[PDB]
Amino acid sequence: QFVNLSPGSTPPVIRLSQGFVSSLVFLDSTGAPWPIAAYDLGDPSSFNIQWD
Amino acid sequence: QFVNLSPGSTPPVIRLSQGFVSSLVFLDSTGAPWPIAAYDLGDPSSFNIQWDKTSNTLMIQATKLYNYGNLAVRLRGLNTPVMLTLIPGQKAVDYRVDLRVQG
Amino acid sequence: EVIDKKAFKDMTRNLYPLNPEQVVKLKQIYETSEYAKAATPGTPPKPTATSQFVNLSPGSTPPVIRLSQGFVSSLVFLDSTGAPWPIAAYDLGDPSSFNIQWDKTSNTLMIQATKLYNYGNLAVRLRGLNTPVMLTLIPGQKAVDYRVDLRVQG
Amino acid sequence: EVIDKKAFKDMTRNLYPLNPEQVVKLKQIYETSEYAKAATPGTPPKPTATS
Amino acid sequence: RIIYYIQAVIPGRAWLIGSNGSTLTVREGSKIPGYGMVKLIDSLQGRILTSSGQVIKFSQEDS
Amino acid sequence: RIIYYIQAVIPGRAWLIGSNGSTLTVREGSKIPGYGMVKLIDSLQGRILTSSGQVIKFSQEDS
Amino acid sequence: RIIYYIQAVIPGRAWLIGSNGSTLTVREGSKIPGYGMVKLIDSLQGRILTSSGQVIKFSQEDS
Amino acid sequence: QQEIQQRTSDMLTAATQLVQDWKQVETQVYTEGT
Amino acid sequence: QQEIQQRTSDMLTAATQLVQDWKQVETQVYTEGT
Amino acid sequence: QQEIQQRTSDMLTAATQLVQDWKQVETQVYTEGT
Amino acid sequence: QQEIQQRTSDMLTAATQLVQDWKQVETQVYTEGT
């Protein structure tokens, strides 16, 4: 997917399943990797995040 | 939204939801970021706030369903503090709000 | 063989005493109950920002600040030109009704009301002034002052 | 099957003994009690500065 | 002429502000210039009765 | 002309925004320009009744 | 013309994506361009009923 | 007739719970950054 | 007739379980990277 | 007739509570800045 | 007739065993290599 940061667009949706792992990788418009500065997760009893 | 600091205008409204994250980012009239000097939260039993102590982004989580409140934000260069009202439980949730401050 | 089915249906019934629709309706009564607990009586106050001029004459009346219980009101102090005027000290009567946050150098006091209808007064001494400034603090009105700007004569 | 409905209604009445409007009026009675406690007898004094 | 608005009210007193910015405080029996004699202070609903028949209220966008 | 939309509503108050970007807050008895006098604020279902017969709602793609 | 596909659905809402890549979210009473008025959102079995008689589903190799 | 008194006991517990829930008001928190 | 009261006991346990499950709200977690 | 005395007991507790609430007056706090 | 209740006891133990077996979800393990 392509993520648009306009103040009119809708946030993107991720389909998951219990006990399974989904990998999210972040690239820019050209496709090169974009390193992560920080993250913030709401409701940690329902999801667990692994990250180097 | 645009924030007017005239002594006649109305303070802005932030729509929240319980357990969800709302991001507040502070920009000037042109749109460049304005780092935050301090903040003050009334009723912390209803809201949870994360902030690294230098940036211009707040992460707000609502704790209760229908309890509403207010918030004070002091920026780095400004002398007038910024007043916000926080309302949960609407039919829309503000995932990210951009506030244009007049200066 | 029907013994197996009868034990199974009574068994299902004992294990899950509530149906799904009953879960939905019980959930619905519960949200209506917190909303009724959380609802506010009358009308809520109107949130306003104001600006007043302070006279240190021996005839004028001291200024009034409208507050609300659990809400924050910010007082910022400015001189006649409009530049900030830092605070030297303050003195609060009745601290069980009000809460004041203040860094020990700035020109802003931040006040929260603790009780519903108990009102008070507060004294502020600035750096250059010899005359102290007295404010009166009234909670529970039909308007709440989110921020008050005070222009001082000097 | 009507046993199930009767049990659900008696349960709802046992779990929440107070109606929503009753929650609202109890809140009104209660805030009125603080207002009556916090009111001051007679007239309050006039605040003055003198010399 | 001059219009007065309620700034604050408790049982007994009322603090009023005028359109010129002057602030006053009044009790049950008191003098108000341009309105007359105060007859009743009603702390609920924000109404002040005056001997001339006028009712003193809050400003409408500031109330 | 100008169209107003509900930004937030609680029992008692309602915060509205206009198509010009101006924001207002109203209570049960209040003045609205171009619509008339407010008759009823219904916090559930997001409807505001007006003396001219109009109903004030949320924007449809923003609600 | 444009074809819409279900991306996600809960009771109440449904997130849809179009063949142009645009994403929308809808509730029970809402406007959809080119299809009409939504009549029923069925969270089980992944079906959306439309006033024109059409049913909105998942893409077949992406479902 | 006796139902008034059983109702008084469940109601008494619920109203005491409601008023004690209405009593608490917590202090605000100020965060300083550098 | 007595079935109303047996039903009251299994139902009481289930409803208490449901309301205590609806009570808990947990704090969010912020992760810092360098 | 006996209702006067039951009323005396709930009323006695409430009036004692009211007068003890009217008794307390707390000292003011002065804050020094540099 | 009483067979419903003996059946209720073996069935109760088996269903409790089944639901407690359905409850557990274990955390994933990440392995780092160098």
XYZ file of C-alpha atoms in Angstrom:
685
model
C 0.000 0.000 0.000
C 0.820 3.679 -0.340
C 0.228 5.824 2.737
C -0.979 9.378 2.204
C -0.395 11.875 4.998
C -2.995 14.349 3.799
C -5.531 15.678 6.341
C -8.327 14.164 4.271
C -7.107 10.626 3.759
C -8.034 7.549 5.793
C -5.511 5.617 7.910
C -4.429 2.195 6.611
C -5.736 -1.157 7.838
C -3.775 -4.286 8.838
C -5.462 -7.706 8.934
C -4.136 -9.988 11.676
C -4.788 -13.350 13.287
C -4.293 -14.665 16.790
C -0.866 -16.140 17.343
C 0.401 -15.342 13.874
C 3.076 -12.827 12.950
C 2.615 -10.028 10.424
C 5.652 -8.098 9.248
C 5.471 -4.410 8.409
C 8.355 -2.893 6.461
C 8.614 0.826 5.797
C 9.929 2.231 2.515
C 9.719 5.692 1.023
C 8.127 6.685 -2.286
C 11.181 5.517 -4.210
C 11.367 2.259 -2.236
C 14.490 2.680 -0.088
C 14.264 1.687 3.603
C 13.304 4.319 6.156
C 14.673 3.684 9.666
C 12.412 4.036 12.674
C 13.001 6.697 15.319
C 10.377 5.668 17.897
C 7.035 3.958 18.319
C 3.993 4.067 20.560
C 1.605 1.148 21.002
C -1.835 1.315 22.553
C -3.332 -1.785 24.272
C -0.255 -3.972 24.887
C -2.249 -6.897 26.335
C -3.683 -7.607 22.910
C -0.600 -7.185 20.739
C 3.109 -7.919 21.192
C 5.720 -6.202 19.040
C 9.236 -7.415 18.329
C 11.773 -4.939 17.043
C 15.513 -4.665 16.884
C -7.028 23.472 12.701
C -5.894 27.059 13.235
C -5.510 28.463 16.781
C -6.346 32.087 17.340
C -5.058 33.637 20.570
C -7.347 36.615 20.491
C -9.198 37.147 23.782
C -12.501 36.569 21.994
C -11.921 33.324 20.110
C -12.900 29.859 21.245
C -10.366 27.242 22.358
C -9.959 24.155 20.159
C -11.556 20.766 20.728
C -9.839 17.367 20.624
C -11.946 14.265 20.007
C -10.672 11.131 21.750
C -11.557 7.505 22.422
C -10.792 5.104 25.238
C -7.714 2.989 24.636
C -6.886 4.716 21.357
C -3.941 6.982 20.573
C -4.269 10.580 19.385
C -1.201 12.463 18.202
C -0.840 16.195 18.740
C 1.787 18.029 16.697
C 2.481 21.743 17.076
C 3.203 23.933 14.042
C 3.407 27.661 13.433
C 1.457 29.730 10.896
C 3.846 28.687 8.163
C 3.795 25.102 9.418
C 7.262 24.516 10.900
C 7.469 22.555 14.179
C 7.485 24.319 17.538
C 9.082 22.279 20.340
C 7.211 22.027 23.600
C 8.552 23.547 26.806
C 5.999 22.144 29.240
C 2.515 20.755 29.643
C -0.004 20.397 32.438
C -2.771 17.823 32.496
C -5.815 18.005 34.685
C -7.468 14.709 35.611
C -4.698 12.158 34.858
C -7.060 9.319 35.823
C -8.846 9.945 32.509
C -5.846 10.583 30.227
C -2.373 9.159 29.703
C 0.344 11.307 28.087
C 3.710 10.364 26.500
C 6.241 12.896 25.452
C 9.955 12.778 25.027
C 11.042 15.909 26.812
C 12.186 17.833 23.697
C 9.893 17.165 20.714
C 6.657 18.787 19.488
C 4.488 15.649 19.526
C 2.178 14.392 22.272
C 0.560 10.937 22.383
C -2.712 10.980 24.270
C -4.710 7.959 25.374
C -8.148 8.252 26.951
C -8.697 6.156 30.065
C -12.402 6.699 30.790
C -15.429 6.632 28.492
C -17.293 9.919 28.941
C -15.213 12.032 31.307
C -14.024 15.212 29.635
C -11.281 17.633 30.488
C -8.817 20.368 29.651
C -5.117 20.753 28.979
C -2.394 23.406 29.240
C 0.586 23.560 26.858
C 3.525 25.989 27.125
C 5.705 26.293 24.019
C 9.364 27.299 23.787
C 9.156 30.835 22.427
C 5.632 31.836 23.344
C 4.485 33.601 26.512
C 0.743 32.896 26.215
C -0.172 29.350 27.308
C -2.361 27.218 25.064
C -5.697 25.836 26.306
C -7.322 22.755 24.815
C -10.499 20.876 25.610
C -10.614 17.077 25.434
C -13.892 15.323 24.682
C -14.172 11.529 24.354
C -17.020 9.461 22.966
C -17.993 11.216 19.754
C -18.854 9.737 16.358
C -15.409 10.716 15.064
C -11.971 10.251 16.566
C -9.085 12.567 15.877
C -6.156 10.405 15.016
C -3.781 13.331 14.385
C -4.495 17.038 14.692
C -2.326 19.760 13.143
C -2.565 23.059 14.989
C -1.390 26.189 13.273
C -0.432 28.682 15.913
C -0.545 32.320 14.948
C 3.071 33.210 15.601
C -28.422 -42.146 22.904
C -30.737 -39.199 23.741
C -29.137 -39.255 27.205
C -25.966 -37.937 25.519
C -27.809 -35.094 23.796
C -29.766 -34.076 26.917
C -26.616 -33.988 29.004
C -24.977 -32.016 26.230
C -27.688 -29.326 26.029
C -27.965 -28.910 29.820
C -24.218 -28.965 29.840
C -23.982 -26.128 27.294
C -26.487 -24.246 29.259
C -24.624 -24.577 32.510
C -21.336 -23.651 31.013
C -22.546 -20.503 29.210
C -25.561 -19.173 31.140
C -25.793 -16.058 28.976
C -26.722 -15.922 25.363
C -24.862 -13.650 22.906
C -27.790 -11.238 22.520
C -28.008 -11.092 26.289
C -24.336 -10.162 26.306
C -25.111 -7.395 23.811
C -28.072 -6.019 25.817
C -26.228 -6.276 29.155
C -23.386 -4.494 27.507
C -25.863 -1.809 26.298
C -27.430 -1.216 29.752
C -23.918 -0.893 31.177
C -22.880 1.853 28.717
C -26.069 3.740 29.374
C -25.308 3.504 33.110
C -21.779 4.994 32.894
C -23.118 7.711 30.593
C -25.802 8.511 33.155
C -23.174 8.564 35.905
C -20.862 10.752 33.800
C -23.534 13.155 32.603
C -23.433 16.678 33.810
C -26.290 18.498 35.523
C -27.606 21.715 34.093
C -25.583 23.244 31.402
C -21.784 23.097 31.418
C -19.999 26.456 31.648
C -18.877 28.291 28.567
C -15.066 28.222 28.116
C -13.765 31.749 27.579
C -10.446 33.564 27.379
C -10.397 37.059 28.857
C -8.319 40.184 29.418
C -8.667 42.682 32.261
C -6.924 45.916 33.300
C -5.705 46.170 36.954
C -6.075 49.408 38.897
C -4.087 49.851 42.110
C -6.171 52.826 43.198
C -7.701 52.832 46.698
C -11.200 52.961 45.236
C -11.340 50.196 42.664
C -12.585 46.657 43.205
C -10.252 43.640 43.017
C -10.607 41.433 39.933
C -12.618 38.227 39.769
C -11.577 34.849 38.342
C -14.233 32.323 37.366
C -13.133 28.743 38.012
C -14.515 25.224 37.944
C -13.789 22.111 39.966
C -11.119 19.950 38.398
C -10.398 22.411 35.601
C -7.246 24.483 35.055
C -7.144 28.276 34.735
C -3.929 30.007 33.680
C -3.084 33.522 34.832
C -0.372 35.325 32.875
C 0.851 38.669 34.104
C 1.777 41.603 31.858
C 2.733 45.234 32.343
C 1.430 48.359 30.600
C 3.516 47.814 27.475
C 2.458 44.170 27.174
C 5.732 42.542 28.105
C 5.658 39.738 30.689
C 6.083 40.656 34.342
C 7.665 37.885 36.425
C 6.316 36.952 39.819
C 8.353 37.350 42.983
C 6.091 35.504 45.431
C 2.559 34.447 46.203
C 0.492 33.692 49.265
C -2.567 31.475 49.130
C -5.308 31.316 51.694
C -7.226 28.022 51.855
C -4.954 25.512 50.038
C -7.486 22.684 50.505
C -9.665 24.313 47.811
C -7.054 25.334 45.234
C -3.941 23.874 43.637
C -1.222 26.091 42.199
C 1.577 25.046 39.909
C 4.404 27.513 39.435
C 7.990 27.353 38.337
C 10.012 29.609 40.622
C 10.913 32.154 37.882
C 8.091 32.656 35.355
C 5.083 35.003 35.146
C 2.314 32.392 34.959
C 0.363 30.794 37.791
C -1.724 27.721 37.046
C -4.731 27.162 39.338
C -7.120 24.201 39.702
C -10.194 24.288 41.941
C -10.606 21.398 44.386
C -14.039 22.064 45.922
C -17.366 22.891 44.299
C -18.559 26.153 45.819
C -15.857 27.305 48.232
C -14.345 30.612 47.168
C -11.238 32.432 48.252
C -8.620 35.089 47.621
C -4.984 35.048 46.714
C -2.036 37.491 46.965
C 0.737 37.965 44.364
C 3.878 40.079 44.817
C 5.764 41.007 41.657
C 9.470 41.759 41.357
C 9.350 45.530 41.027
C 6.112 46.245 42.834
C 5.745 47.155 46.475
C 1.949 46.962 46.384
C 0.701 43.349 46.421
C -1.971 42.250 43.976
C -5.132 40.635 45.370
C -7.353 38.479 43.276
C -10.621 36.819 44.201
C -11.343 33.278 43.109
C -14.916 32.167 42.565
C -15.685 28.638 41.308
C -18.859 27.188 39.862
C -20.069 29.822 37.436
C -21.766 29.650 34.043
C -18.472 30.535 32.365
C -14.965 29.254 33.005
C -11.880 31.376 32.366
C -9.307 29.246 30.598
C -6.718 32.047 30.458
C -6.786 35.559 31.862
C -4.456 38.345 30.734
C -3.978 41.134 33.299
C -2.570 44.485 32.225
C -0.895 46.240 35.149
C -0.605 50.026 35.359
C 3.086 50.303 36.125
C -37.879 -20.556 27.666
C -39.757 -17.774 29.519
C -37.825 -18.835 32.639
C -34.712 -17.528 30.869
C -36.275 -14.127 30.131
C -37.596 -13.770 33.684
C -34.185 -14.574 35.075
C -32.585 -12.022 32.777
C -34.960 -9.231 33.850
C -34.617 -10.006 37.598
C -30.916 -10.053 37.027
C -30.924 -6.683 35.375
C -32.869 -5.293 38.312
C -30.450 -6.888 40.774
C -27.314 -5.706 38.990
C -28.403 -2.089 38.529
C -30.784 -1.106 41.289
C -30.805 2.512 40.130
C -32.221 3.793 36.919
C -30.317 6.358 34.801
C -32.731 9.202 35.598
C -32.335 8.279 39.248
C -28.584 8.563 38.828
C -29.093 12.033 37.361
C -31.500 13.204 40.109
C -29.293 11.760 42.879
C -26.474 13.787 41.378
C -28.723 16.892 41.513
C -29.696 16.278 45.126
C -26.086 15.782 45.985
C -24.749 18.949 44.319
C -27.587 20.854 45.928
C -26.365 19.506 49.277
C -22.886 20.976 48.711
C -24.385 24.267 47.561
C -26.518 24.470 50.697
C -23.557 23.540 52.898
C -21.202 26.010 51.209
C -23.545 28.988 51.192
C -22.802 31.805 53.593
C -25.271 33.213 56.139
C -26.361 36.823 55.845
C -24.638 38.931 53.297
C -20.921 38.590 52.570
C -18.701 41.592 53.364
C -17.573 44.108 50.752
C -13.860 43.845 49.794
C -12.169 47.244 50.110
C -8.721 48.836 49.946
C -8.059 51.768 52.289
C -5.449 54.353 53.263
C -26.271 54.749 27.613
C -24.356 52.313 29.899
C -25.060 48.565 29.986
C -24.036 46.440 32.970
C -23.273 42.713 32.875
C -22.949 40.080 35.567
C -19.340 38.987 36.077
C -19.964 36.880 39.180
C -22.802 36.194 41.607
C -23.048 34.383 44.951
C -25.960 34.484 47.427
C -25.875 38.014 48.742
C -23.360 39.674 46.418
C -23.042 40.267 42.701
C -19.995 41.552 40.826
C -20.896 43.535 37.709
C -18.862 45.039 34.877
C -19.919 47.916 32.642
C -19.369 48.643 28.977
C -16.765 51.226 30.010
C -14.824 48.483 31.819
C -15.635 49.675 35.341
C -16.296 46.967 37.921
C -18.657 47.190 40.886
C -19.966 44.898 43.617
C -23.494 45.031 45.054
C -25.582 43.501 47.829
C -29.362 43.394 48.335
C -29.889 47.062 49.141
C -27.523 49.174 47.066
C -27.353 52.018 44.544
C -26.748 51.446 40.836
C -26.249 54.491 38.538
C -28.723 54.630 35.656
C -30.835 51.699 36.828
C -32.191 52.668 40.243
C -32.540 50.615 43.424
C -31.826 46.848 43.611
C -34.902 44.856 44.629
C -33.804 41.190 44.428
C -30.608 39.266 43.762
C -31.367 35.779 42.402
C -28.141 33.752 42.482
C -29.697 30.900 40.497
C -30.437 31.596 36.787
C -28.262 34.764 36.827
C -30.900 37.479 37.092
C -30.847 40.757 39.010
C -34.078 42.687 39.535
C -33.995 46.491 39.552
C -36.470 49.126 40.812
C -36.918 50.397 37.253
C -38.068 46.965 36.096
C -34.810 46.043 34.380
C -33.090 42.672 34.718
C -29.301 42.468 34.819
C -27.743 39.441 33.070
C -24.530 38.041 31.584
C -23.254 39.120 28.166
C -24.711 36.715 25.609
C -21.506 35.543 23.879
C -19.692 35.865 27.252
C -21.730 33.771 29.718
C -24.979 30.803 2.383
C -23.194 29.412 5.500
C -23.498 25.776 6.612
C -22.731 24.744 10.194
C -21.568 21.294 11.300
C -21.389 19.595 14.672
C -17.807 19.235 15.905
C -18.678 18.008 19.398
C -21.770 17.616 21.567
C -22.339 16.796 25.245
C -25.596 17.152 27.216
C -26.095 20.882 27.424
C -23.441 22.179 25.024
C -22.611 21.751 21.365
C -19.465 22.898 19.566
C -20.077 23.775 15.916
C -17.797 24.712 13.026
C -18.794 26.662 9.929
C -17.760 26.410 6.305
C -15.641 29.533 6.822
C -13.725 27.722 9.584
C -15.197 29.717 12.470
C -15.959 27.770 15.640
C -18.765 28.460 18.105
C -20.231 26.856 21.219
C -23.933 26.860 22.125
C -26.251 25.876 24.961
C -30.031 25.358 25.026
C -31.068 28.985 24.639
C -28.645 30.759 22.323
C -28.389 32.780 19.109
C -27.156 31.289 15.837
C -26.634 33.611 12.815
C -28.629 32.573 9.749
C -30.572 29.808 11.480
C -32.539 31.481 14.269
C -33.158 30.368 17.852
C -32.084 26.953 19.233
C -35.050 24.892 20.425
C -33.548 21.519 21.455
C -30.100 19.980 21.773
C -30.260 16.180 21.433
C -26.888 14.756 22.492
C -27.801 11.267 21.274
C -28.023 10.781 17.465
C -26.234 14.118 16.818
C -29.155 16.379 15.950
C -29.753 20.032 16.801
C -33.212 21.534 16.342
C -33.540 25.159 15.237
C -36.451 27.645 15.356
C -36.472 27.791 11.553
C -37.052 24.043 11.342
C -33.488 23.170 10.373
C -31.490 20.320 11.899
C -27.765 20.714 12.503
C -25.637 17.586 11.930
C -22.102 16.316 11.318
C -20.430 16.573 7.909
C -21.205 13.362 6.029
C -17.663 12.240 5.116
C -16.441 13.756 8.430
C -18.603 12.157 11.150
C -16.602 1.901 -14.098
C -15.267 1.692 -10.492
C -15.342 -1.520 -8.439
C -15.128 -1.432 -4.639
C -13.791 -4.231 -2.434
C -14.034 -4.926 1.273
C -10.720 -4.359 3.057
C -12.066 -4.745 6.593
C -15.435 -5.050 8.318
C -16.567 -4.954 11.956
C -20.148 -4.626 13.254
C -21.109 -1.107 12.308
C -18.231 -0.074 10.043
C -16.702 -1.310 6.818
C -13.437 -0.183 5.234
C -13.469 -0.410 1.438
C -10.825 0.090 -1.243
C -11.461 0.963 -4.878
C -9.760 -0.063 -8.091
C -8.149 3.388 -8.194
C -6.572 2.709 -4.786
C -8.771 5.125 -2.836
C -9.867 3.987 0.618
C -13.135 4.836 2.353
C -14.949 3.891 5.554
C -18.728 3.532 5.881
C -21.396 2.966 8.518
C -25.036 1.874 8.188
C -26.400 5.051 6.631
C -23.821 6.522 4.275
C -23.220 7.636 0.688
C -21.243 5.557 -1.808
C -20.452 7.051 -5.262
C -21.718 4.932 -8.153
C -23.609 2.443 -5.996
C -26.235 4.447 -4.117
C -27.363 4.233 -0.493
C -26.168 1.527 1.950
C -29.039 -0.602 3.248
C -27.368 -3.292 5.407
C -23.880 -4.109 6.643
C -23.530 -7.836 7.390
C -20.265 -8.362 9.284
C -20.527 -12.149 9.002
C -19.991 -13.652 5.503
C -18.516 -10.357 4.187
C -21.473 -8.913 2.298
C -22.639 -5.313 1.969
C -26.109 -4.572 0.608
C -26.651 -1.471 -1.527
C -29.803 0.450 -2.545
C -29.145 -0.418 -6.193
C -29.236 -4.132 -5.397
C -25.477 -4.636 -5.555
C -23.473 -6.616 -3.005
C -19.993 -5.475 -2.013
C -17.446 -8.253 -1.354
C -13.733 -9.046 -1.064
C -11.510 -9.427 -4.128
C -11.548 -13.101 -5.095
C -7.791 -13.832 -5.131
C -7.382 -11.317 -2.253
C -9.803 -12.473 0.473
C -44.636 -4.683 51.743
C -41.243 -6.045 52.959
C -39.956 -5.451 49.431
C -39.479 -1.773 50.331
C -36.848 -2.768 52.888
C -35.011 -5.337 50.660
C -34.955 -2.617 48.009
C -33.676 -0.221 50.631
C -30.642 -2.435 51.253
C -29.518 -2.934 47.572
C -30.311 0.729 46.926
C -28.375 1.787 50.014
C -25.271 0.020 48.829
C -25.585 1.455 45.308
C -26.190 5.038 46.507
C -23.275 4.891 48.959
C -21.121 3.643 46.091
C -22.310 6.492 43.876
C -21.685 9.246 46.411
C -18.198 7.932 47.304
C -17.481 7.853 43.571
C -18.591 11.440 43.283
C -16.266 12.528 46.164
C -12.758 12.171 44.718
C -10.915 15.014 42.983
C -7.232 14.406 42.082
C -4.315 16.864 41.761
C -3.060 17.954 38.300
C 0.429 17.042 36.995
C 2.957 19.495 35.526
C 5.760 18.211 33.301
C 9.000 20.186 32.791
C 11.181 19.717 29.705
C 14.832 20.397 28.811
C -40.536 -21.895 40.315
C -37.219 -22.549 42.163
C -35.538 -22.543 38.752
C -35.543 -18.727 38.870
C -33.190 -18.842 41.854
C -30.834 -21.570 40.459
C -30.691 -19.470 37.297
C -30.009 -16.446 39.453
C -26.885 -18.093 40.873
C -25.239 -19.197 37.537
C -26.288 -15.873 36.019
C -24.891 -13.971 38.992
C -21.502 -15.549 38.570
C -21.481 -14.922 34.808
C -22.585 -11.271 35.115
C -20.020 -10.549 37.843
C -17.393 -12.086 35.573
C -18.548 -9.924 32.669
C -18.535 -6.651 34.590
C -15.087 -7.313 36.125
C -13.875 -8.072 32.602
C -15.279 -4.786 31.413
C -13.473 -2.850 34.221
C -9.787 -3.063 33.281
C -8.014 -0.434 31.175
C -4.202 -0.758 30.837
C -1.519 1.921 30.305
C 0.074 2.421 26.847
C 3.776 1.694 26.162
C 6.227 4.085 24.476
C 9.413 2.723 22.906
C 12.486 4.933 22.332
C 15.093 4.110 19.679
C 18.746 5.036 19.063
C -44.361 8.815 67.943
C -41.093 6.782 68.111
C -40.214 8.271 64.724
C -39.046 11.423 66.527
C -36.284 9.415 68.197
C -35.194 7.456 65.049
C -35.066 10.828 63.306
C -33.083 12.158 66.230
C -30.382 9.537 65.661
C -29.855 10.056 61.851
C -30.139 13.807 62.413
C -27.664 13.657 65.285
C -25.066 12.000 63.126
C -25.618 14.459 60.264
C -25.485 17.554 62.509
C -22.324 16.347 64.271
C -20.801 15.797 60.837
C -21.812 19.299 59.758
C -20.425 21.064 62.816
C -17.102 19.163 62.677
C -16.916 20.141 59.008
C -17.473 23.746 59.942
C -14.638 23.643 62.559
C -11.458 23.354 60.480
C -9.440 26.366 59.321
C -6.053 25.654 57.655
C -2.855 27.754 57.534
C -1.919 29.697 54.357
C 1.173 28.841 52.256
C 3.836 31.328 51.120
C 6.076 30.476 48.167
C 9.489 32.140 47.674
C 11.133 32.391 44.249
C 14.692 32.900 42.958
C -33.002 -40.333 35.389
C -29.984 -39.969 37.756
C -27.778 -40.716 34.751
C -28.151 -37.067 33.697
C -26.316 -35.996 36.849
C -23.524 -38.661 36.666
C -23.060 -37.562 33.062
C -23.020 -33.981 34.258
C -20.031 -34.708 36.503
C -17.769 -36.493 33.903
C -18.857 -33.921 31.321
C -18.143 -31.072 33.724
C -14.601 -32.227 34.242
C -14.024 -32.714 30.502
C -15.493 -29.316 29.538
C -13.485 -27.494 32.220
C -10.394 -29.249 30.882
C -11.252 -28.193 27.334
C -11.853 -24.536 28.150
C -8.655 -24.252 30.241
C -6.823 -25.820 27.305
C -8.308 -23.239 25.001
C -7.169 -20.350 27.290
C -3.375 -20.321 26.939
C -1.531 -18.194 24.377
C 2.299 -18.078 24.645
C 4.774 -15.326 23.668
C 6.857 -15.633 20.458
C 10.673 -16.014 20.507
C 13.137 -13.900 18.500
C 16.648 -15.210 17.843
C 19.556 -12.861 17.019
C 22.625 -14.050 15.102
C 26.230 -12.851 14.705
